[PDB]
Symmetry: D3
Subunit: 92 residues, 6 copies
């Protein structure tokens, strides 16, 4: 199936100061976790970089492609301290 | 891939009184059907328990994980009488 | 898993006059690409036929079922001239 | 991904008998169940029409594409008498 | 899709030794890794309990269902000593 | 899921000849096509470099990861001359 490309990525790094739900509502797919909701974030990173529909493809170094949601969800839930995410905006 | 957990679930039971689209717009994924739209439901259950982005993981006893959407869609379409759903809210 | 059906489809044909993002924000799944966003389209077709949550199942003749998003995304990105899409509205 | 073929299918029909296993070890995949191994001498129809590597795509009327192995396996295990399968030999 | 069985699991335990490969060729699938081929004579436990076509579903405590093969394979490759597997024999 | 390896790849190159089948029975999976079975004696390069269980991951320049088998199979079937494959031997 010849045509195949990138999916340009951008980073979103934040500090997980306990007492905060990242605010991200997620949806699992083959390439990562789709953002369903983003209640006006609490990280300049999320607020000025993320939007509904964006797909988080890597979390703290772990590629999310192909991972069962039970695994990816656990990764997000265990976020403590410096959180770093790679994201792609699927708008051809 | 060590970290792996639950996905806490909650139930939504309603009475399928003919003449009503459940109002649920769906999206298929590996763990179930994602709710795309929920036009102000017509079941105290849906209205006070469901939101866009929630994932229905079981319908009338049939687990939706891994099912082709052609199958899950048919299950919803054939809903008649007591409808019972297990749902998870993917917000780490 | 006995129950299995159709997914009625409808078409959306437009003219790709350069200088326009189709405006479609996409989400990959097993049957096609889910529309995440549809900024008030620029094609009578998209504006009067598409809505958030709809799933594009075929693009210019290529069925999108089972295709890696890296492939489908590339197909949309390379759209030039007469664009034809088959879509399904997942509302049981 | 342009090239996409419809696969050739042949039929295998037999009558299961108590105490006589089908003798097929199955491996699930997106289009059906691959015969990972088979014991010759169980049923004449299997010996005459099936070979290691063949992929069973329909079992007693139910299409196996996309089904979780827990469902496909249940279908095979639940057949006490008539067995009708559609199969493809994946040897390009 | 109503019929859906919980698969029978058996345990295989061994102590890996330097210079002695497990001798198993693996094929990934949704529930685990199918033993596509195996060389007899490597480990007594494999010779006594495993056969071509068996599907390894858990490896040293990690469930293999849904894992990308790049992860499952890494788990197998990383075992230098104790190996504990859960396995199912898919022969309906 | 932390552990995730990049798999070792080797090349297989041959010139297909009319009347001489490749002799490979393929089984689709997420990373490519497993050689479920193969008939020795067809091509010297296959006899010298391939074995049952090997997984073909690229065919004549097209990566096979994630492709529907209907597409991968079409690629193999469409090769009338030069055949260049990338392959991995999944034996941890």
């Amino acid at each position: 199936g010849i045509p195949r490309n990138s999916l340009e990525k951008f980073n979103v790094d934040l500090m997980k100061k306990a007492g905060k739900e990242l605010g991200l509502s997620l949806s699992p797919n083959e390439i990562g976790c789709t953002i369903a909701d983003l209640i006006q974030g609490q990280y300049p990173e999320i607020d000025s970089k993320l939007q509904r529909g964006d797909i988080i493809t890597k979390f703290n170094g772990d590629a999310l492609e192909g991972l069962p949601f039970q695994v990816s969800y656990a990764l997000f839930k265990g976020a403590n301290g410096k959180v770093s995410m790679e994201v792609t905006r699927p708008k051809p």
